[PDB]
């Protein structure tokens, strides 16, 4: 049986960071990301397109939370426009 998600995605479903993480600066879109233990966690309401995420949840108002590996570039759909976001960390 596999695990269900991370339940750290419930915390990064809100803006509150995972405990003992490191903040990253997402530049280019309205997203935040943290780096907990060799995995970054993005809170956004854009759609993550390129770098492959391992886990997601999504709120009632449609902001998603993603658990993925440390990619320096995210690619997103904003509203059909495909954009990139730089992270630093």
């Amino acid at each position: 049986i596999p695990p269900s998600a991370n339940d750290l995605l419930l915390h990064v479903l809100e803006g509150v960071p995972p405990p003992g993480s490191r903040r990253l600066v997402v530049s280019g879109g309205d997203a935040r990301a943290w780096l907990s233990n060799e995995k970054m966690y993005v809170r956004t309401n854009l759609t993550i397109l390129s770098p492959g995420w391992l886990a997601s949840m999504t709120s009632a108002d449609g902001t998603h939370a993603y658990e993925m590996q440390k990619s320096p570039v995210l690619l997103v759909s904003w509203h059909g426009k495909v954009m990139q976001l730089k992270v630093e960390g």
Partner: protein, 148 residues
């Protein structure tokens, strides 16, 4: 580095807005919706979906104005005054809106949708029905919402 402007300045917004309003293209701007308003004699010929050659400079300044915002969908719609039939009217304004959207798509907008439609004088903006395409009811308008 991240960029300050997206290839657009606020002085160029108000300069192109007051130059189009000086040229008679009425640019209203309500909130975050934007409406530019071209009279049909200023860009097409009379009762025809063929654009004149001099009006492509007007559409060049229209597309250089529409380069400056970020938008998801621009709806171009058009209606001319009542000429032969309402079916003739709707076919004429549908062809007019799709050829001005074809030129605005081949020029640089940054939009994702252009919604082109035409109506058979179903929305006049005066009760004066003075003529053909010389009437200000006979027009094309370009309406969008500026995104963020």
């Amino acid at each position: 580095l991240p960029c300050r402007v997206d290839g657009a300045c606020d002085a160029t917004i108000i300069k192109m807005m007051t130059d189009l309003n000086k040229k008679g293209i009425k640019v209203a701007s309500v909130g975050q919706n934007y409406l530019i308003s071209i009279p049909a004699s200023a860009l097409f010929a009379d009762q025809s979906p063929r654009l004149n050659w001099a009006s492509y400079s007007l559409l060049n300044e229209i597309a250089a104005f529409l380069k400056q915002f970020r938008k998801i969908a621009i709806t171009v719609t058009s209606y001319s005054s009542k000429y032969v039939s309402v079916k003739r009217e709707r076919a004429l304004t549908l062809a007019r809106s799709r050829v001005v959207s074809e030129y605005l798509w081949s020029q640089g907008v940054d939009s994702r949708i252009i919604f082109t439609q035409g109506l058979g004088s179903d929305k006049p903006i005066t009760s004066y029905t003075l003529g053909g395409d010389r009437s200000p009811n006979a027009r094309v308008e370009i309406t969008f919402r500026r995104a963020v």
